[PDB]
DNA sequence: AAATTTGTTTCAATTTGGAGCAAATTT
DNA sequence: AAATTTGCTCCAAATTGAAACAAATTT
């Protein structure tokens, strides 16, 4: 049979463990570390824009990558992200990606 | 200048920040490699799910379960926050 | 030459938001 | 006992969708 691949393991990153051994942790964990570190450093400051801050950090590289894959083809890129072709066009504009 | 970064270690044992966006790129590079032209279908929802969870999980930590505060920190309607928490069954 | 994608629209569907309130919970 | 937060509403503002169609482009 096929071994189960849980959703947390579809997107992963190389990490190194306490034994100089390259293993492969979830992307969720990267996001976790990012915010942990954001919070420590935040130190007293009030925040208002944390969702957009994150979402922007993540949409950029996603859009970047999917366009590379679709060799610049917007119809496929939107189709594979499962978003309307209009929305994609809009996100790309947002990020000066054209 | 980059508020959202993660820690990397190089071969010389030196630790060093790296923007989170780089990790997300890596993730996807890899996703696509393994895919051998199998069609991808809801990549956006996929990644969104992978990000909102640890986001929700950590602001709730930080705001000690205070939904009103969390919703303000993130800048989304308090109603929206509930919806999401339900979406991932974090209520 | 044919097929596809792009760059627009216009309008409908869904989601996000803002506010208001009693009931609960924290302070 | 006050103040703040929760769990609702109802609406309205905004974003997302979908479908169309010349005109540009890629096959």
Curated annotation (Swiss-Prot), chain A:
DNA-binding region: 74-93
Gene Ontology MF term list: core promoter sequence-specific DNA binding; DNA binding; DNA-binding transcription activator activity; DNA-binding transcription repressor activity; protein homodimerization activity; sequence-specific DNA binding; sequence-specific DNA binding, bending; transcription cis-regulatory region binding
Statement: the UniProt record of this protein carries the keyword Transcription: yes
Encoding gene, per UniProt annotation: fis
UniProt name for this protein: DNA-binding protein Fis
Compartments, as annotated in UniProt: Cytoplasm, Nucleoid
A Pfam family annotated for this UniProt entry: HTH_8
Keyword Transcription regulation applies: yes
Primary localization class, coarse: cytoplasm
The species this protein was found in: Escherichia coli (strain K12)
One Gene Ontology term, aspect cellular component: nucleosome
């Amino acid at each position: 049979m096929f071994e189960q691949r849980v959703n947390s393991d579809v997107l992963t990153v190389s990490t190194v463990n306490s034994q100089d051994q390259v293993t492969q942790k979830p992307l969720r964990d990267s996001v976790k570390q990012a915010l942990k570190n954001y919070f420590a450093q935040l130190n007293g400051q009030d925040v208002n824009d944390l969702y957009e801050l994150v979402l922007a950090e993540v949409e950029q590289p996603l859009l970047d990558m999917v366009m590379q894959y679709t060799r610049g083809n917007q119809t496929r890129a939107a189709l594979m992200m499962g978003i309307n072709r209009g929305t994609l066009r809009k996100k790309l504009k947002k990020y000066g990606m054209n």
